[PDB]
Design a protein around this ligand. Structure first.
Ligand SMILES: Nc1ncnc2c1ncn2[C@@H]1O[C@H](COP(=O)(O)OP(=O)(O)O)[C@@H](O)[C@H]1O
Ligand code: VO4
Ligand SMILES: [Ca+2]
Ligand SMILES: [Mg+2]
Ligand SMILES: [Mg+2]
Lengths: 141, 155, 806
């Protein structure tokens, strides 16, 4: 993970750790979370701290972020995979086809993964823009 | 009926591939049995595949790689056409005896007789093999027979 | 679809309830019966041989001899298509099968190598162009029995074996020979045709309406009886298409021209020429539209119940046009026909004192000389007082009443016969296209066997030809068949089916015979009817069991009889009156000289001497032999026509009459040799190429026999079902037909295998892509899962709220 990236993770961690005790707790999350709108409740708060083997210091923080953010492909590799199902290289796939591929083939998406995947995918006139969707996936926008 | 080493594994490879395309789960739909063997190099008639257990439509029955091996070895021993057999069949449809058959007849024979191929398949086998009919609209079936027997990747 | 098989196939669905009956070969059987020929019975009491049955027909009882009983076939064989497959081949079974089919509407049935055709006496929808389309190139066992399969099978053998074929259609008068001859020619003309006046095919077909107009005439047995025989050859070129056609005629009954018996008519052409169907012609022929007006054609009936003389005359006129006839030739014929009509109206009287014979007006002789192209005065002179020459002289002499009515009659008879033969040559001229000919298919249609209340030379001649054709059939079906087996090295013990008519044939044909005695007595200036009767009785009475003194009259009103002849188809009482005269036809060179130089082109042709006749029997006997031999050079295909009853009624069966016909025909015998011998035979050359596919196994050229042996051997064929000849391989009945089925099963399999190869190629082509798309989809599903887990991660849903203000 790039350096400029680590620099942002720090400042972020600095802002999340309220009591400035070097470690992130259920009290800090709640506190800074409330100043921005909504306290994930103690119910969910535990689970957040349950995602780290032991104490939650900047080392762990930056670790759990790489796990859950590394092991993906370049916007060009996904772009290429979608192209393998678009022989007429029209840059789009029929909505019914791509939904079929995702739901009943390979590693079948459950009904839930389908709703979330499509609740915001680019679709007009039965056409599924895989290019604009590829961009979206690479969370840059 | 004694599968060699390559064969036993090419089947495992081809099995997973078809397993993946209907939902990776160690199973393959029985309606794809024939298709799996065609990938292995065997040209089983639909009558054989139904015999060894193959189903008529997707969703009726799935098959673990275990129940598969028997079917493959069943279709493995069936009869495969030979050039001479094919050329004698075609000769009964050719009057002039020059080795020519109407393009309409070819489509007739392939989609009306035997275990009828769909019009979609006949069109596709004709585009792939690059079958060219001449002005009078005839085709040299010997040439067509050889192409089909040569496989998608000749040389 | 099925619709065309209306009167051809057996429902077997509704006839499935007809094969599902309570039967028992120990109980049910056939028993002789005066009425129906055989009655279905059910055995009951037992007494050594005195077996007591119960006739189901009328629920009555009867006691028959254990030797008169006949085995009944199970319901399974109802309306069986090929009688040679029945379990019990007996006169009753054959009778029941045909009768059953007949009543169902099925008029065609196979019986071993030949076909049986029962006259329907009504039009059936089985001869359309659609039915023809379904029978082309079909195997007999593959499609319902139909006259068409016989024609087709004939065509198939001709191209396959490269040998001429001949369809012999036999039968008693009115059994349906002519009708069947027509369809056979029509069928060949519509499947073998090549790529004002019509094409050749059309012409072959139009050749019928005219010859029949001049050669047919109502008869007690047939309203459209063929009074002449015809052998027609259809030629074929290299490519197997029609390339010409000729016709040959045999013995045209000339007595009918100037005479008719009660309830009988003169040739059709006469009544339609006076039908005023084409008014604009009445003034060309000079006739009044009234048939009952001329004595040469008004002696019997004038109209026929199912013959419309009008439309028929129109169709005749049209035929002549499609035939390529000029308006001249056409009107030339029409005129000479009317000439004869008028000839009968010419009146004469016996001079005042010199009781001789003289003219009596000339209105008629004038019309005659006019149409014929001569001088009416030069005509009556040659009829009332001729100049008999000697080497180069003349002897003027007048004649009396009968001498004159005979010379005129003779002139009519001569002009007509002479014109019929001209009509034939002209027709051949047209059908003779100089295309390349390799083989031909001949169709023979003679005048059937017949018994009138009065039988004369006409009938002797006809029944003779039939005798000789039935013999050509048994010699071919029972004698040659067996000579063939023996000649091929096949161990075969000869069987005698008792089908030989030489006795009756030699009595007529050979030097001892009738026609020889008749031919001898035409050389004696003073031979008489009585003199003839003596020489006959002298060499045959009590001397030959076929020649017999006339028995006791067995029919209402039958004329004089001088001797009976035991023909194969029955015993015939003949009257030899006027035979010496009918056999040799007097040629009045006084009149042939006149007509010879006639302004009329046709008549001028019809009468040409030559440059610088025998008896009729001699001519007929020779011609019949010339033809009978040509037929041995071909491969015969027989159709046996059968007349159902004597009322020309549809669906009515006279059991005794049919049986009688099945008997003299030799149907039963024919079916026996078919199941006792090896009807199928194939030259090894042909067997190889047709069935190697039944065992491709081999094939590393190799002689034909060896290959033929490996296939049969490898097919596990019961050695009893066939025999390896020294040239051909013989098969039992039924065998070769299953091989044809296997060969088809095989072809359908090879085709299905070629189809599986295709299915296997389409897949193997989409393989690479399928595995490359597995990579693509695993990548797509994996990166979409990361994206989801992330966007839904509590932590990420915080790094994004803080990320902004850093
Ligand atoms: N196949 C048939 N279809 C319709 N009518 C027929 C058929 N065969 C015979 N007939 C009828 O019976 C009569 C005898 O026919 P035909 O062929 O002329 O006898 P021959 O055997 O005397 O030629 C015909 O004029 C016709 O009305
Ligand atoms: O009556 V038929 O003479 O044509 O046999
Ligand atoms: Ca699966
Ligand atoms: Mg803290
Ligand atoms: Mg006839």
């Amino acid at each position: 993970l790039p350096q400029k990236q680590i620099q942002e993770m720090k400042e972020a961690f600095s802002m999340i750790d309220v009591d400035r005790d070097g470690f992130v707790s259920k009290e800090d999350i709640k506190a800074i979370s409330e100043q921005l709108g909504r306290a994930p409740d103690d119910k969910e708060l535990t689970a957040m701290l349950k995602e780290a083997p032991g104490p939650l210091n900047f080392t762990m923080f930056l670790s759990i972020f790489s796990d859950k953010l590394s092991g993906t492909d370049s916007e060009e590799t996904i772009r290429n995979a979608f192209a393998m199902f678009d022989e007429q290289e029209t840059k789009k796939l029929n909505i019914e086809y791509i939904k079929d591929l995702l739901e009943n083939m390979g590693d079948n998406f459950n009904k839930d993964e389908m709703r979330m995947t499509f609740k915001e995918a680019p679709v007009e006139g039965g056409k599924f823009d895989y290019v604009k969707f590829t961009a979206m996936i690479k969370g840059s926008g | 009926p004694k599968l060699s080493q390559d064969e036993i594994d090419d089947l495992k490879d081809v099995f997973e591939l078809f397993d993946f395309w209907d939902g990776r789960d160690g199973a393959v739909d029985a309606f794809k049995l024939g298709d799996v063997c065609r990938c292995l190099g065997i040209n089983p008639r639909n009558e054989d595949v139904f015999a060894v257990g193959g189903t008529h439509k997707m969703g009726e029955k799935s098959l673990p790689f275990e129940e598969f091996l028997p079917a493959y070895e069943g279709l493995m021993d069936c009869e495969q056409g030979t050039f001479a057999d094919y050329m004698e069949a075609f000769k009964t449809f050719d009057r002039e005896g020059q080795g020519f058959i109407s393009g309409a007849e070819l489509r007739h024979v392939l989609t009306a007789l035997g275990e009828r191929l769909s019009d979609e398949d006949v069109d596709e086998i004709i585009k792939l093999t690059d079958l060219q009919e001449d002005l009078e609209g005839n085709v040299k079936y010997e040439d067509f027979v050889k192409k089909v027997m040569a496989g998608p990747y000749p040389d | 679809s099925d619709p065309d098989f209306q009167y051809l196939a057996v429902d077997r669905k509704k006839l499935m309830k007809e094969q599902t009956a309570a039967f028992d070969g120990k109980k049910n059987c056939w028993v002789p019966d005066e009425k129906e020929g055989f009655a279905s019975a059910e055995i009951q009491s037992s007494k050594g041989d005195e077996i007591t049955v119960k006739i189901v027909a009328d629920s009555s009882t009867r006691t028959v001899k254990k030797d008169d009983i006949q085995s009944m076939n199970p319901p399974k064989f109802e309306k069986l298509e090929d009688m040679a497959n029945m379990t019990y081949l007996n006169e009753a079974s054959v009778l029941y099968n045909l009768r059953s089919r007949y009543t169902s509407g099925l008029i065609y049935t196979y019986s071993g190598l030949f076909c049986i055709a029962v006259n329907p006496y009504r039009r059936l929808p089985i001869y359309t162009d659609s039915v023809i389309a379904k029978y082309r190139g079909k195997r007999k066992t593959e499609i319902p029995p139909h006259l068409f399969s016989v024609a087709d099978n004939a065509y198939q053998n001709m191209v396959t074996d490269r040998e001429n074929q001949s369809c012999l259609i036999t039968g008693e008068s009115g059994a349906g020979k002519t009708e069947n001859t027509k369809k056979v020619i029509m069928y060949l003309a519509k499947v073998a045709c090549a790529v004002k006046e019509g094409s050749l095919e059309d012409q072959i077909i139009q050749a019928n309406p005219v010859l029949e107009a001049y050669g047919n005439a109502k008869t007690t047995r047939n309203n459209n009886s063929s009074r002449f025989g015809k052998f027609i050859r259809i030629h074929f070129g290299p490519t197997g298409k029609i390339a010409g056609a000729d016709i040959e005629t045999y013995l045209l009954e000339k007595s009918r021209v100037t005479y008719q018996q009660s309830a009988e008519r003169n040739y059709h052409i006469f009544y339609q020429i006076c039908s005023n169907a084409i008014p604009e012609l009445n003034d060309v022929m000079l006739v009044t539209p009234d048939s009952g007006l001329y004595s040469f054609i008004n002696q019997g009936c004038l109209t026929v119940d199912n013959i419309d003389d009008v439309e028929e005359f129109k169709l005749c006129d049209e035929a002549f046009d499609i035939l390529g006839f000029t308006k001249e030739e056409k009107q030339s014929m029409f005129k000479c026909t009317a000439s004869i009509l008028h000839m009968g109206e010419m009146k004469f009287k016996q001079r005042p004192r010199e009781e001789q014979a003289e003219s009596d007006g000339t209105a008629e002789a004038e019309k005659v000389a006019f149409l014929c192209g001569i001088n009416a005065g030069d005509l009556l002179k040659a009829l009332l007082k001729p100049k008999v020459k000697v080497g180069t002289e003349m002897v003027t002499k007048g004649q009396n009443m009968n001498q004159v009515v005979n010379s005129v009659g003779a002139l009519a008879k001569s002009l007509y016969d002479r014109m019929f033969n001209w009509l034939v040559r002209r027709v051949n001229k047209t059908l003779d296209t100089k295309a390349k000919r390799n083989y031909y298919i001949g169709v023979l249609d003679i005048a059937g066997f017949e018994i009138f209340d009065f039988n004369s030379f006409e009938q002797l001649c006809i029944n003779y030809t039939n005798e000789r054709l039935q013999q050509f059939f048994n010699h071919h079906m029972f004698i040659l068949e067996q000579e063939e087996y023996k000649k091929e090295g096949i161990a075969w013990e000869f069987i005698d089916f008792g089908m030989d008519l030489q006795m009756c044939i030699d009595l007529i044909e050979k030097p001892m015979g009738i026609l020889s005695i008749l031919e001898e007595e035409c050389m004696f200036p003073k031979a008489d009817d009585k003199s003839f009767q003596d020489k006959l009785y002298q060499n045959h009475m009590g001397k030959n069991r076929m020649f017999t003194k006339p028995g006791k009259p067995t029919r209402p009103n039958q004329g004089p009889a001088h001797f009976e002849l035991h023909h194969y188809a029955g015993n015939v009482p003949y009257s030899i009156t006027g035979w010496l005269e009918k056999n040799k036809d007097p040629i009045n060179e006084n009149v042939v000289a006149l007509l010879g130089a006639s302004k009329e082109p046709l008549v001028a042709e019809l009468f040409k001497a030559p440059e610088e006749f025998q008896t009729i029997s001699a001519v007929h006997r020779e011609s019949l032999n010339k033809l009978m031999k040509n037929l041995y050079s071909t491969h015969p295909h027989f159709v046996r026509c059968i007349i159902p009853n004597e009322l020309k009624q549809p669906g009515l069966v006279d059991a005794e009459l049919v049986l009688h016909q099945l008997q003299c025909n030799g149907v039963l015998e024919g079916i026996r040799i078919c199941r006792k011998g090896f009807p199928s035979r194939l030259i090894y050359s042909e067997f190889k190429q047709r069935y190697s596919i039944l065992a491709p196994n081999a094939i590393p050229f190799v002689d034909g026999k060896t290959v033929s042996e490996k296939i049969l051997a490898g097919l596990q064929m019961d050695p009893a079902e066939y025999r390896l000849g020294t040239t051909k391989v013989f098969f039992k009945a039924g065998v070769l037909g299953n091989l044809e089925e296997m060969r088809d099963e095989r072809l359908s399999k090879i085709i299905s295998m070629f189809q599986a190869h295709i299915r296997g190629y389409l897949i193997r082509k989409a393989y690479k892509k399928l595995q490359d798309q597995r990579i693509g989809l695993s990548v797509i599903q994996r990166n979409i899962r990361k994206w989801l887990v992330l966007r839904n991660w509590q932590w990420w849903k915080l790094y994004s709220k803080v990320k902004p203000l850093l």
